[PDB]
Amino acid sequence: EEEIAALVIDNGSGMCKAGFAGDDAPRAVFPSIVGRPRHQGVMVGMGQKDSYVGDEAQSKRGILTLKYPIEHGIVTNWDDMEKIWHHTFYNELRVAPEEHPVLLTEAPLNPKANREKMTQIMFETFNTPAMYVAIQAVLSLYASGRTTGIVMDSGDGVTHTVPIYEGYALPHAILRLDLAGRDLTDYLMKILTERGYSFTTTAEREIVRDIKEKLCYVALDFEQEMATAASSSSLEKSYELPDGQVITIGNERFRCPEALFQPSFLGMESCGIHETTFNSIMKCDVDIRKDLYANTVLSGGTTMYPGIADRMQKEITALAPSTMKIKIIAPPERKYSVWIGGSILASLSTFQQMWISKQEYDESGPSIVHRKCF
Amino acid sequence: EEEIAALVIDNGSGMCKAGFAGDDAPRAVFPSIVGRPRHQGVMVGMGQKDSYVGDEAQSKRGILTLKYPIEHGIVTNWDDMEKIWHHTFYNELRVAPEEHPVLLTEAPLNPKANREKMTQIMFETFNTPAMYVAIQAVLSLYASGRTTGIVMDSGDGVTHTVPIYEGYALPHAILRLDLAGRDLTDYLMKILTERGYSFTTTAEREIVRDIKEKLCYVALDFEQEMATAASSSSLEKSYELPDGQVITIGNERFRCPEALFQPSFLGMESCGIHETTFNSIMKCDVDIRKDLYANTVLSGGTTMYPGIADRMQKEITALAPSTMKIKIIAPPERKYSVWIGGSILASLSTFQQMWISKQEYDESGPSIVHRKCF
Amino acid sequence: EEEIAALVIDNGSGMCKAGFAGDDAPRAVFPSIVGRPRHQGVMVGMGQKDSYVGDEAQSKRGILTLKYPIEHGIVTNWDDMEKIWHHTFYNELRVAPEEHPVLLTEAPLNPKANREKMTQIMFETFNTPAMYVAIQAVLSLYASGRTTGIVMDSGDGVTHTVPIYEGYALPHAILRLDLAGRDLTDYLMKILTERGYSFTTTAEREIVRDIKEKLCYVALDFEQEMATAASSSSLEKSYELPDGQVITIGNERFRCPEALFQPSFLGMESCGIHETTFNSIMKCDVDIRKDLYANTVLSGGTTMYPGIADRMQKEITALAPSTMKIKIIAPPERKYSVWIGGSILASLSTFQQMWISKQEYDESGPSIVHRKCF
Amino acid sequence: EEEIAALVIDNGSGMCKAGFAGDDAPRAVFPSIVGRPRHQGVMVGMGQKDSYVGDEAQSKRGILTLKYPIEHGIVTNWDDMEKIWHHTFYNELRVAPEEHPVLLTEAPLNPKANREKMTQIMFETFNTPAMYVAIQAVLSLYASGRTTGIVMDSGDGVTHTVPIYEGYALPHAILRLDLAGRDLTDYLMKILTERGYSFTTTAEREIVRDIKEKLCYVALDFEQEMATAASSSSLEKSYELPDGQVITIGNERFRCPEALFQPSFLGMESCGIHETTFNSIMKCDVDIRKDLYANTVLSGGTTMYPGIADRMQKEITALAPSTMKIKIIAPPERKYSVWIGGSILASLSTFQQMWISKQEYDESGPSIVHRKCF
Numbered sequence A, B, C, D: 001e002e003e004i005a006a007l008v009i010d011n012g013s014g015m016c017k018a019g020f021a022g023d024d025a026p027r028a029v030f031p032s033i034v035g036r037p038r039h040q041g042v043m044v045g046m047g048q049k050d051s052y053v054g055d056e057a058q059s060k061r062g063i064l065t066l067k068y069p070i071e072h073g074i075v076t077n078w079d080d081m082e083k084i085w086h087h088t089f090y091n092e093l094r095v096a097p098e099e100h101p102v103l104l105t106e107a108p109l110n111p112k113a114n115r116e117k118m119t120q121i122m123f124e125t126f127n128t129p130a131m132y133v134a135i136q137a138v139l140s141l142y143a144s145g146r147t148t149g150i151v152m153d154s155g156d157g158v159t160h161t162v163p164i165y166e167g168y169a170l171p172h173a174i175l176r177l178d179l180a181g182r183d184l185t186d187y188l189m190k191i192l193t194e195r196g197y198s199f200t201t202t203a204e205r206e207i208v209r210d211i212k213e214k215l216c217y218v219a220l221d222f223e224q225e226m227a228t229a230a231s232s233s234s235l236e237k238s239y240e241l242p243d244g245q246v247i248t249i250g251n252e253r254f255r256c257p258e259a260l261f262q263p264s265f266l267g268m269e270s271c272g273i274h275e276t277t278f279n280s281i282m283k284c285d286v287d288i289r290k291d292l293y294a295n296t297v298l299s300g301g302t303t304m305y306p307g308i309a310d311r312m313q314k315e316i317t318a319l320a321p322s323t324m325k326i327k328i329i330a331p332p333e334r335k336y337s338v339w340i341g342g343s344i345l346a347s348l349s350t351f352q353q354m355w356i357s358k359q360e361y362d363e364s365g366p367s368i369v370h371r372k373c374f
């Protein structure tokens, strides 16, 4: 008589997005933090709570300590992590998770001690009829409507690439880097002490993160800008703190995003973001390199810096031979690319035969996810 | 009022040609390979097939393993071989094989365990009204319009000669060599590692084969060219890979085709291609040697190397006595010589009495081919 | 008045061994790496060097980047490679290379652009009175004191086989595979992320390599062990990192060495180590296959895994016909088999007439090595 | 208590037999082949010879090319042929040929350019005191102890008959055929490709020859056996190759020896072995035909096929008139019949006056053999 749908929860590491299948945008988006008070309080006639989750913690962050339940794509705290899902199902979507299947996302090359515990939580605490776990990068390709190209995923905790030629994925060419937005925010705080501003409290870290995504951009030619910025002052901008003071940042605007292409700034030795894509392609066969060069897809929040498309094209061209053409495909909605691909996949007619049923969990539940989602 | 035609299928070993009788060119030509995927695939919304046959496999050869159903003129796989014929009858010629007789070709000195199974397949699976099997080399003589001369057949798996004086064939002078294009391609890969290029995958073998038939030629004087090529550099050519890189080959241009005249390079002890023709002629009677010397006919794909006619004339002259004249007849269309001869033979007025009827198969079908085609 | 000896330098790809002729063991063994600092340093009163070569780099590897001058048996860097030889001649053997002939080793089927540059370095920079280059696998047979059998060489960069019947070698049966210890170490790092341990730095790669040669073994029956290891826990061992933490590895003990017999794990399509030996033997004549089956000789560092002799016998028996007996000869000192054979060869009375003299280099020096060592 | 031993060699074409006079069996028997290496060799510490003669070549035939110095009873190579005699005199009989007369055998109707060169070799290189040349077939009659009958000689290169009535020989009735064991071996290789086994190398020809003299027999009624062999399978036998594989031959057991009675199989037009004997007898006078019919003597290696005596009796009876009785005399030791007759002849008291002395050679040596041995 009625019909059902499927929830898509792109958990990620740093921001949680939830919604219903069939739509083109998430319904609820909120940062994933857990805060606790650190004082005693003197007032008696107040309904003082014990823990704040989600947007509420972002409001009263002057008297709390904020802790992130997920670090580098691997969840470390489970008591706090249970609270995040409990908030999403009840106070945001207002849907009881007992008749609607759930779909999750998870980064590649992670311990399968993680995927085991995800099965235990949702099949015991909430008792969902079905669930499935998919790679984040693969879902990004569904949004573009294409089945050929190498996808670059760069969220807040991890950065990985996976090539797909045509309906097949090569598992031996997957790479991974532990360099993402969290490392850039800590780097910006280190170099913002240059002008006399010092932020040390975890509450003040949120203020620094806001500056990063409001005034930073990637320079087309790094060396030329430093000469220009040193002489004149046309690149200086002013920002206003919540306290009322005004701060001005000069050459720091493009020094922070430049760390993506030169990881040597942070003290880590590794290839840049542009060189990782080149190495991934060269690990494929000789007849696939032509199509992959003409289809490169970007995704993730970190990629949203203005002018990042032009710089990536220049870097790849100098490395690849001059005969073929290099094209970077950067859709304007790349921030929600992962979530949209999840909605399309869960609505396919032929995908309904791949769910993990409640009956299957009864026999070898903690180990079924390894083989059925391989 | 309505007449039926006859299909000619020069199966060969390495390339299949099909067409209708009465024409001067085959209608469908495609390599005979069968490919299967070797990965798992992650995409759901794709019509992923299980096996690719013919030109389709040559397109997506970056994710497949290619296997040849025929090796050295003897078919080894029958499940894959059935697929090749099924593709030819339906998806290329678009004719139902239930009212048109079929004609095949087959190399001499092969096991008649082979010709038995060919009868079983076409008289049970497709139920053709009639069929006939003929020697490949004999059909080549019909195209030239002559009935006197020794024909040299050199395809991709076998190389054989058969002399015919006048309307009669001598069965005791037929020779055979297991040296053909497949051995040359493997030899080229072995010596192409000299300059740093290494091809090992079966998909990369197709790239090496393309180079062979685009840049190789036979030298008139082998020893003189090596002295010339070593000093100067006017014999160097450049080729472009599908990946975009450029490769240059020097003295390797004529080292590969030279293996035909000196089989000692490959580690096999045997006479060269030129010496085999001499030995075949000397096995005939004393009054036939004059006419055979003045009519030598070449055929097959391997013979298409430029400058092979001049070298063969020089080799034979040094062996035969100086009195008679040696002439090598190399028509410009020798690549399709076998097929054209099949079309003419099937259209003869007096050949219609030699078909193998469906009634004859009922009594001693698996054994009738031995006596009726003798 | 005095007498001369000959130095033997089994260069290999990954470890260098040097010594004097007539002995039974190398005098100096050290890894072949070159390291450079990646920081600036603040201390003034220190004798800070610019580059570290050999065992010194292995000590202070916490602040250096290690680079291998040789990859896959083909040297890529010559400035760094010159440093390795300079260290060996002076700081380890303490002998001036101006009166003692030198002997080298080199893998088969390599570009002879390589052997040309080896001649240039030793005849100009050091000016050695004589030198000679020999195949690695052939030298291994001298140590066994036998002249009949197929030798399997598996070092760190290459894996090749060459058959020798009796005093003669067949050059058309030599095979080669690009699968060696370096590929196994990278594979172990990929699957060691399963339990939460992540090594990414080139300095941390040396730690992973140490685990491989201290806790890994080859299982007699691969499928049976997985069933046993999954249920019980008697196959688990513990290892201690330099930092102090303890790590435990379960079924990963035998999953890494199993990649030798099934190259499909790494994404490469090729025959296993056992199947390559079978194909090499079948390329010989019909009367040689009996003696080669009864004499198989192993060598190289990779072959030192416990229990590899028993597994190889089982694999060959299933392929070869049951009549003959299969014997695998694995001497306990197979790690130094190549070097010992070099010492014996350089001490033979009849070998002194095959050196390349300084006079010969003056005429056609860069090209004499091709013909005199053929 | 003293005599001059005689060395008696029945050179033949395909096998050499040597021994001393007065014995009943040859002392040394070995195939007459000469082999040379066709590779280069890498080993230094080996006593590698340049040419192998006799039984040694039969051992290491996997790396050599075997050449027969004698073809069709006419020696073609003299440098190789000198080596065969040098081996026999020194390394097998261990007797210096300077005091013992030598006796040879030679087929009839051969060029007396041959017998001239035999005189030159033994009277210059070895300087034997005396020598004599005799017809092979005549010597066969001495072994039987009879002086009336027609002898059939069929070795490996030639087949000839000569009638002798009583103490006299008729020179105008001698016949000759170029059909012997060598033609049968080549025929067997041609029809053994029927079942999929292909032997092409000269080393593999020796394996085919071994099968011929171990599993072949002559059928009493050719047409009846084919009907029997086609229906049932009681005539199939299995043979084991040196490699270990097993092969089975069906009706090929008696198809090869049948070519002797029907030369039309090989493409040669001639009378059979049975018809040649009939034609030879009919060339004699009318009063001799009765005794010759009752005494037919066989000899040679080719005649050793089982059941050849019964078939020959049936063939002759149908041709000759029914009045007289036909008897075929086939002694069990017919393989050494020629040699034994040589031993008896050289020991006769009245034969010592027919030697060719060293003094006679000085005047007209190259021409004395024509008249003194007429």
Ligand SMILES: Nc1ncnc2c1ncn2[C@@H]1O[C@H](COP(=O)(O)OP(=O)(O)O)[C@@H](O)[C@H]1O
Pocket (backbone or CB within 6 Å): A011, A012, A013, A014, A015, A016, A154, A155, A156, A181, A182, A209, A212, A213, A214, A300, A301, A302, A304, A305, A335
């Ligand atoms: N406009 C922007 N410019 C730069 N960085 C941005 C921008 N918007 C978001 N980010 C970065 O995106 C990071 C999170 O990316 P996101 O894709 O939301 O993570 P996840 O993949 O876990 O959902 C933040 O930590 C922030 O630094």
Ligand SMILES: Nc1ncnc2c1ncn2[C@@H]1O[C@H](COP(=O)(O)OP(=O)(O)O)[C@@H](O)[C@H]1O
Pocket (backbone or CB within 6 Å): B010, B011, B012, B013, B014, B015, B016, B154, B155, B156, B157, B181, B182, B209, B212, B213, B214, B300, B301, B302, B304, B305, B335
């Ligand atoms: N232009 C060319 N130059 C050199 N070789 C060629 C050329 N065209 C075809 N060949 C060779 O001819 C072979 C094809 O022979 P084919 O006609 O298929 O014989 P068959 O039909 O008996 O199998 C291929 O293996 C290829 O190497």
Ligand SMILES: Nc1ncnc2c1ncn2[C@@H]1O[C@H](COP(=O)(O)OP(=O)(O)O)[C@@H](O)[C@H]1O
Pocket (backbone or CB within 6 Å): C010, C011, C012, C013, C014, C015, C154, C155, C156, C157, C181, C182, C212, C213, C214, C300, C301, C302, C303, C304, C305, C335
């Ligand atoms: N005990 C061991 N167990 C497993 N592997 C080993 C052991 N000892 C050495 N190896 C492997 O052998 C390799 C060394 O090979 P080596 O003898 O240097 O070859 P080459 O001299 O040709 O370079 C190392 O990479 C290492 O992985």
Ligand SMILES: Nc1ncnc2c1ncn2[C@@H]1O[C@H](COP(=O)(O)OP(=O)(O)O)[C@@H](O)[C@H]1O
Pocket (backbone or CB within 6 Å): D010, D011, D012, D013, D014, D015, D016, D154, D155, D156, D157, D181, D182, D212, D213, D214, D300, D301, D302, D303, D304, D305, D306, D335
């Ligand atoms: N048992 C046998 N069955 C069949 N053929 C045989 C047998 N023994 C020997 N032969 C044939 O006889 C030949 C040997 O003849 P041989 O006595 O050497 O003649 P000659 O001495 O004149 O050379 C061989 O080629 C072999 O084929």
Ligand SMILES: [Mg+2]
Pocket (backbone or CB within 6 Å): A012, A154, A155, A300, A301, A338
């Ligand atoms: Mg994301």
Ligand SMILES: [Mg+2]
Pocket (backbone or CB within 6 Å): B012, B136, B154, B155, B300, B301, B338
């Ligand atoms: Mg052809």
Ligand SMILES: [Mg+2]
Pocket (backbone or CB within 6 Å): C012, C136, C153, C154, C155, C300, C301, C338
């Ligand atoms: Mg080694």
Ligand SMILES: [Mg+2]
Pocket (backbone or CB within 6 Å): D010, D012, D136, D155, D300, D301, D338
């Ligand atoms: Mg004889």
